[PDB]
Amino acid sequence: GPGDPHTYEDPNQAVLKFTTEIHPSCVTRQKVIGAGEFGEVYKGMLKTSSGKKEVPVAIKTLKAGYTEKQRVDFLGEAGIMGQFSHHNIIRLEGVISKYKPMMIITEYMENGALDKFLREKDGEFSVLQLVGMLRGIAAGMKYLANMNYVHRDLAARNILVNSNLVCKVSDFGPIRWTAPEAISYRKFTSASDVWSFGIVMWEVMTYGERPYWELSNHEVMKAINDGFRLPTPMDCPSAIYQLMMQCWQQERARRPKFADIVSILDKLIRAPDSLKTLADFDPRVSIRLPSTPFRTVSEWLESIKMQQYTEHFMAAGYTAIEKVVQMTNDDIKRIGVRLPGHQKRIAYSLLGLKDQVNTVGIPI
Ligand SMILES: Nc1ncnc2c1ncn2[C@@H]1O[C@H](COP(=O)(O)OP(=O)(O)CP(=O)(O)O)[C@@H](O)[C@H]1O
Ligand SMILES: [Mg+2]
């Protein structure tokens, strides 16, 4: 579980260790329900034990004529999925790796992909019901982050919905969903997943509108890099749009963590009157212009790419900004910032931080 060693970089080993090899005689294939990258997807039934009643499943298959790399990549997804056990993460029943066709057998999600489901159900849920869907997705992502798993492809199309409307993250083992630092520098983290989650929030509250659909990919690239952002969906609580914008902070360290997101959404759901104030919706607006105070020492340090010293500050008792602004340049040396260039970068930043805490602006 969390904290335990994980196997995210060895597909065959994860298949061996974390999947149940299912005998083909236990699987009954029924109607086709989708087309995947590697082959058709079916609804079916699974006998897990000789003396047990069959249970409904989804059956993902690998197309005939596959290459061995396609086979490894296909089954590798199950090796990842089998390490997870959470209400909002797709549950793996097992795989067939010994006989053709290769199969991945999962719980059946009758309502399919969330973006398609919401378009089919346009306008038919309450805002509160939509926020509960987002809470379920966030809870799954909180679990993945705690499992030190970065998803990299979080989008409404990769959330599946079952008959009880439970939303579950899938797709283990797309510029409009990807954080700026992940596109430009390939820095994928749970914080870039949080960016994606903000996009998912926008997809859900718009009932499956395509993000930045008015724009080409090249225009999306300028938008995200320069700081343009999606405008509010129609009928979107201000608290929910403000959370989207927080997920889309340019500086990844300023984005909320998934544990924070779940707590925020829980508070809103428990007091649903908090959802009644809406963000101003103007149908003529397609994009917001760029937006023009550090909460933690870690945020401040990462803003200047000095996060490698975070624990050095904490251990010495410099755990808040109001403490940091009292630091001399010799204190920085004292706690272990040895490299002169790093001393200089922190010293200069502290000057600006001291300007900030001493700023006064009282309207009369
Ligand atoms: N457990 C499940 N229950 C019900 N339907 C499912 C399902 N798993 C997959 N599907 C259906 O099959 C479709 C495609 O499945 P899936 O997303 O796994 O293919 P894929 O993973 O190859 C796309 P990509 O290559 O972009 O990751 C889904 O849109 C979904 O409708
Ligand atoms: Mg997938």
Residue numbers in the entry: 587 to 759, 780 to 898, 905 to 976
Article excerpt on this structure:
The Eph receptors are the largest receptor tyrosine kinase family, and together with their cell surface-anchored ephrin ligands represent an important cell-cell communication system that regulates a multitude of physiological and pathological processes. The intracellular portion of the Eph receptors includes a juxtamembrane segment, the tyrosine kinase domain, a linker, a sterile alpha motif (SAM) domain, and a short C-terminal tail containing a PDZ domain-binding motif. EphA2 promotes cancer malignancy through a poorly understood non-canonical form of signaling involving serine/threonine phosphorylation of the linker connecting its kinase and SAM domains. The kinase-SAM linker contains a cluster of five serine/threonine residues that besides S897 include S892, T898, S899 and S901.
To obtain insights into EphA2 signaling mechanisms, we solved the crystal structure of most of the unphosphorylated EphA2 intracellular region (residues D590-I976). The crystallographic asymmetric unit contains two EphA2 molecules (molecules A and B), even though the EphA2 intracellular region is monomeric in solution. In our structure, the αA′-helix is unwound and Y594 (the second of two conserved juxtamembrane tyrosine residues) occupies a pocket previously found to be occupied by the first conserved tyrosine (Y588 in EphA2, which is not part of our construct), indicating a dynamic conformation of the juxtamembrane segment even when its tyrosine residues are unphosphorylated. The relative orientation of the kinase and SAM domains is different in the two EphA2 molecules, suggesting that the EphA2 intracellular region can assume different conformations, likely enabled by flexibility in the kinase-SAM linker. In contrast, residues S899-P905 (including the S899 and S901 phosphorylation sites) are mostly undefined in both EphA2 molecules, likely due to high conformational flexibility. Thus, conformational differences in these residues appear to be the main reason for the different relative orientations of the kinase and SAM domains in the two EphA2 molecules. In both EphA2 molecules, the N-terminal part of the linker is partly wrapped around the bottom of the kinase domain C-lobe and locked in place by interactions of I893 with a hydrophobic pocket in the kinase domain. This linker conformation is different from that observed in EphA2 structures that do not contain the SAM domain, where most of the linker (including I893) faces away from the kinase domain, suggesting that the SAM domain affects linker conformation. The correlation of the two exchange processes and the complementary charges of the two surfaces suggest that the kinase and SAM domains interact with each other, shielding the interacting surfaces from the solvent.
